[PDB]
């Protein structure tokens, strides 16, 4: 057990931006925080840090309180809107950050090319880009041995050839027993890696847990889209009555959603008649779980 929040709410004077957050964590998990902007995800990891006082409770971070530097060593932090000292060599900033983390200069070299900035290293970071800031912003969290990891929108402005590269690096990190904390706003991609989702409400929490039992309580349809399969008439009248929404288009395709237990039994009959050309089907995803859980309460 690493991070344990105990019923804590958080205010900004009268602006109580957190409502009664009780949230725990084991020691190998991968967490996904979601929700709207302003829901408190940047406020959440600050409360995991010592940056904010737990107003109506306390946190238990590695069995401890977050104001201790022996507890504040093995975490790994990356914020949103990350910025640095704009006048230095970015390796030298990381060489400056290595002295604060205690890791030697044998780590700063490979981490610069793990995020792949060695082609344009040793320049000013104000002469970098938004990806090149965030790739440098990734690397300071990679210093030493981060047992805890904290990721406040890490994938912003990143190449998708390298966005899932950190996901495999995330997948390389929970195998060696390092629990991460990940919030994101791109909802695809992360679902291969998230062990437990923690989508939360406005000030409150909505739901917790892993992916599949979160799909239980959500009424979830599968989604089928087509364009000119064989017919328009029979596809409408087969699903206006048989427990589905036959959304009645006209280009010889009726885009009917099935209820995801109903695609097992009749899509063998369906696309045998609707002779298929290029048709994709959409499982009710975590993104589809999100908008339900957004609309589950207000």
Ligand X SMILES: Nc1ncnc2c1ncn2[C@@H]1O[C@H](COP(=O)(O)OP(=O)(O)OP(=O)(O)O)[C@@H](O)[C@H]1O
Name the site residues for ligand X (rule: CB under 6 A).
12, 15, 17, 35-43, 80, 120, 127-132, 157
Is residue 238 close enough to count as binding Mg ion by CB under 5 A?
A: no
Question: 10 burial class (0-12, 13-18, 19+ CB within 10 angstroms)?
Answer: buried
Q: How far is the CB of 182 from another protein (least distance, A)?
A: 16
Say how far apart CA 112 and CA 136 lie, in whole Å: 7
Contact indicator for 256, 248 with CB cutoff of 8 Å: no
Decide: helix, strand or coil at residue 114. Answer: helix
Which of 31, 3, 22, 27 lies closest to 184 in space, CA to CA? Answer: 31
- Of 59-118, binders to a second copy (CB under 8 A) are 80-81, 83
Site string for another protein, 55-94 (x = CB under 8 A): --------------xx-xx-xxx-x-xxxxxxxx---x--
Selected binder of a second copy within 36, 64, 99, 247 (CB under 8 A): 36
40 annotated to a ligand binding site: yes
Q: Which two tokens stand for residue 205?
A: 């929490």
Q: Which of residues 224-263 bind a second copy (CB under 8 A)?
A: 263
Q: Is 36 annotated as a binding residue?
A: yes
Q: Does 42 bind a second copy (CB under 8 A)?
A: yes
- Choose among 193, 166, 167: nearest CA to 30: 193
Name which of 125 and 256 has its Cβ closer to ligand X: 125
Q: Interface mask (CB under 5 A) for Mg ion, residues 7-46, using x and -?
A: ----------------------------------xx----
Between 198 and 224, CB nearer to ligand X: 198
Task: Determine which helix (DSSP H) or strand (DSSP E) holds 164, and give its type and residue range.
Answer: helix 160-171
Phi (first) and psi of residue 267, to 5 degrees:
-70, -20
Q: In whole angstroms, give the CA distance from residue 32 to residue 26.
A: 14
Is 42 annotated to bind a ligand? Reply is yes
DSSP state of 173: T
Q: Is 38 annotated as a binding residue?
A: yes
127 binds another protein (CB under 8 A): no
Residues near Mg ion (CB under 5 A) are: 41-42
Residue ranges of the binding site for ATP: 35-42
- Residue ranges in contact with a second copy by CB under 8 A: 12, 35-38, 41-42, 80-81, 83, 119-120, 127-135, 153, 155-163, 185-188, 222, 263-264, 267-268, 270-283, 287, 290-291, 294
Annotated binding-site members: 35-42
């Amino acid at each position: 057990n690493a991070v344990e929040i105990q019923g804590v709410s958080q205010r900004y004077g009268s602006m109580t931006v957190l409502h009664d957050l009780n949230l725990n964590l084991g020691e190998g998990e991968v967490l996904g925080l979601f929700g709207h902007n302003g829901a408190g995800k940047t406020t959440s990891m600050k409360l995991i840090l010592g940056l904010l006082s737990p107003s109506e409770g306390q946190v238990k971070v590695l069995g401890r309180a977050p104001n201790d530097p022996q507890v504040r060593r093995q975490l790994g932090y990356l914020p949103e809107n990350v910025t640095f000292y704009p006048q230095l060599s970015g390796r030298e900033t990381l060489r400056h950050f290595a002295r604060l983390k205690g890791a030697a200069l044998t780590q700063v070299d490979e981490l610069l090319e793990q995020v792949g900035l060695a082609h344009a290293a040793d320049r000013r970071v104000k002469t970098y880009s938004k990806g090149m800031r965030q790739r440098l912003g990734l690397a300071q969290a990679l210093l030493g041995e981060p047992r805890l990891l904290l990721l406040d929108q890490p994938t912003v402005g990143l190449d998708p050839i390298a966005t899932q590269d950190l996901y495999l690096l995330i997948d390389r990190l929970r195998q060696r027993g390092t629990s991460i904390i990940l919030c994101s706003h791109v909802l695809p991609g992360v679902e291969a890696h998230i062990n437990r989702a923690a989508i939360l409400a406005k000030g409150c929490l909505q739901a917790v847990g892993s992916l599949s039992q979160l799909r239980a309580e959500a009424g979830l349809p599968v989604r089928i889209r087509a364009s000119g399969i064989s017919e328009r008439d029979s596809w409408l009248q087969r699903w206006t009555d048989a427990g589905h929404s036959a959304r009645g288009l006209s280009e010889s395709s009726i885009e009917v959603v099935a209820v995801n237990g109903h695609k097992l039994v009749l899509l063998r009959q369906l696309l045998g008649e609707g002779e298929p050309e290029d048709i994709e089907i959409h499982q009710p995803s975590l993104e589809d779980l999100y908008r339900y859980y957004m609309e589950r309460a207000g």
